[PDB]
Amino acid sequence: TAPCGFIVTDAVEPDQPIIYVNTVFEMVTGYRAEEVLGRNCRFLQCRGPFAKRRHPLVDSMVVSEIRKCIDEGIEFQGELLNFRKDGSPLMNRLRLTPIYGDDDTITHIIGIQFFI
Amino acid sequence: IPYPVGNLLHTAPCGFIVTDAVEPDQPIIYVNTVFEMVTGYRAEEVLGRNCRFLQCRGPFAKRRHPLVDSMVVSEIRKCIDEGIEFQGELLNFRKDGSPLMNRLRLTPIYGDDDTITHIIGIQFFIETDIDLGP
Ligand SMILES: Cc1cc2nc3c(=O)[nH]c(=O)nc-3n(C[C@H](O)[C@H](O)[C@H](O)COP(=O)(O)O)c2cc1C
Ligand SMILES: Cc1cc2nc3c(=O)[nH]c(=O)nc-3n(C[C@H](O)[C@H](O)[C@H](O)COP(=O)(O)O)c2cc1C
């Protein structure tokens, strides 16, 4: 199976909703595709589906760089704490890469998750 | 009663490929189901090989087809070697010989410390007018 989680967001809709996750994402995070479709990926920074705030131990500096990289259309790589649906911790080595469309808009961002 | 993974797999919008950037000549270590379905090549046929077989017209042609854009192929080579990103359209072929326009994105993965361990390819297959006739 894939060595990594794969995520595709729609870069044209507001706030990068997920339109696809692969089976490694589902297996490792314990969320199912149907639960996460249309949501922003940031719920992974909250400890389980009932925590309403980002966890203190997710590095706000990395989050902030992710936001910037997305805003500016440029690739990203870094590591931040995430959580499985059962609230258990995940170290997510994350790479984001924009997909440019026919001309010359970003249509998609791809996320690649190496859990380490 | 568990809930299965992969329920919306049929909606995957692109091919995904992973190569081992450490081993020689970027051999493929994973392809997803979109890749298989669109190219007609099934994972067992492609693992261990370089992705360039897709530039040959089907599995019994040993060399890249002359209508594949050799300039673009060169840039791909350069971006991989320089450890940088690539996005471009490239003519490929299904196993059945039919033409494929492959909007390919390559992105390197840096590992623990602190070198490229993988490359991810993302394929958005799009339409062409290219048609090699009956
Ligand atoms: C394609 C894509 C994949 C993402 N994957 C993750 C992820 O796996 N884990 C995570 O914490 N954030 C991920 N994010 C980041 C959040 O969705 C969001 O960009 C981040 O939390 C910063 O924005 P914010 O301050 O508004 O929360 C991803 C973003 C995109 C666009
Ligand atoms: C991760 C990855 C995915 C690739 N995807 C394929 C592809 O789908 N189609 C293709 O023609 N080449 C693809 N390539 C490109 C070839 O493998 C090769 O790098 C390219 O043709 C340039 O090298 P060459 O001139 O030695 O053949 C991919 C390369 C990498 C690293």
Numbering used by the authors:
A (entry chain A): 14 to 129
B (entry chain B): 4 to 137
Can you list sentences taken from the study reporting this PDB entry?
Dark and light state structures of V48I:G80R confirm concerted movement of Q154 that is linked to conformational changes in V/I48. Light state crystals of V48I:G80R were obtained as follows. Prior to setting screens V48I:G80R protein was exposed to a broad spectrum white flood light (150 W), while on ice for two minutes. Comparing the dark-state to V48I:G80R grown in the light, confirms density for the C4A adduct and confirms direct crystallization of the light-state. For light-state structures clear density is observed for the adduct state in two of four molecules. Difference density maps of the light-state molecule indicate that adduct formation is coupled to rotation of Q154 to a buried position. Unexpectedly, rotation of Q154 requires concerted movement of I48 that reorients the Ncap. In the light, V48I disrupts rotation of Q154 to the buried conformation, thereby leading to a predominantly exposed conformation regardless of lighting conditions.
A plant called Arabidopsis thaliana has a light-sensitive protein called ZEITLUPE (or ZTL for short) that helps it keep its circadian clock in sync with the cycle of night and day. In Arabidopsis thaliana, three LOV domain containing proteins ZTL, FLAVIN-BINDING, KELCH REPEAT, F-BOX 1 (FKF1), and LOV KELCH PROTEIN 2 (LKP2) act in circadian timing and seasonal flowering. Recent research indicates that their divergent roles in the circadian clock and photoperiodic flowering may enable interrogation of how chemistry regulates PAS/LOV protein function to select for signaling pathways. These proteins retain analogous elements, where an N-terminal LOV domain regulates activity of a C-terminal E3 ubiquitin ligase to target clock proteins for degradation in a time dependent manner. LOV domains are typified by blue-light induced formation of a C4a adduct between a conserved Cys residue and a bound flavin (FAD, FMN or riboflavin) cofactor.
